């Protein structure tokens, strides 16, 4: 059981695009005050992931990588593969 991976379910607020949340405070879920102590109307937002090779594929862990490019000007960083002419009508591909 790979319980190292964990997820959050009892979070009050939504997140903006590409917004990180790392706070692990006890989530106050309702009317009765908790004063920071889990109990009535209070849950822990963090939950460990039950992750074993014996599991359903939907329940099975998936490694997800998200890349957010910016196809705009300014120097890039990635561009697979020249010589500049200087007076003739020639197609140019200067950094993008």
């Amino acid at each position, epitope marked *: *059981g790979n*319980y190292n991976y964990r997820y959050r379910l*009892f979070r009050k607020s939504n997140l903006k695009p590409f917004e990180r949340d790392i706070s692990t405070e006890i989530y106050q*879920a309702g009317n009765k005050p908790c004063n920071g102590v*889990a*109990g*009535v*109307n*209070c*849950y822990f937002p963090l*939950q*460990s992931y*039950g992750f*074993r090779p*014996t*599991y*359903g594929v939907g*329940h099975q862990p998936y490694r997800v990588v998200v890349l957010s490019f910016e196809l705009l000007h300014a120097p890039a960083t990635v561009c697979g593969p020249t010589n500049l002419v200087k007076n003739k009508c020639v197609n140019f591909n200067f950094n993008g």
Partner: nanobody
Amino acid sequence: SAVQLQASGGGFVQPGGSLRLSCAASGWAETFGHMGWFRQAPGKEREFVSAIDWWDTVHYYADSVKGRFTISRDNSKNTVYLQMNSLRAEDTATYYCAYWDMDYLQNSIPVDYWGQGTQVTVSS
């Protein structure tokens, strides 16, 4: 499908004795599923303890608790009861009540719920 499983009780007891673990549901679940417990030793990862259904038909005990810890649900009180005996070292930890959701157990793998626990300490 969100339960605020309420837990209460605890105290300090002596080694080699016996006690009980508490786990009661005070919220709205997703179905009539299984109930159990999970424990975590200091400096060690969380460890599964025991598994039992809504009707105490199937009795899955851990080997560290077999013959000594006898889990059993209630005729009418709707509460499983892990009654201990001859306590060992591994059974003294911070316990969390487990809750699965299945009738025919193909595998004991899928978990569905969690709740608060009871502060049980076993020392002289």
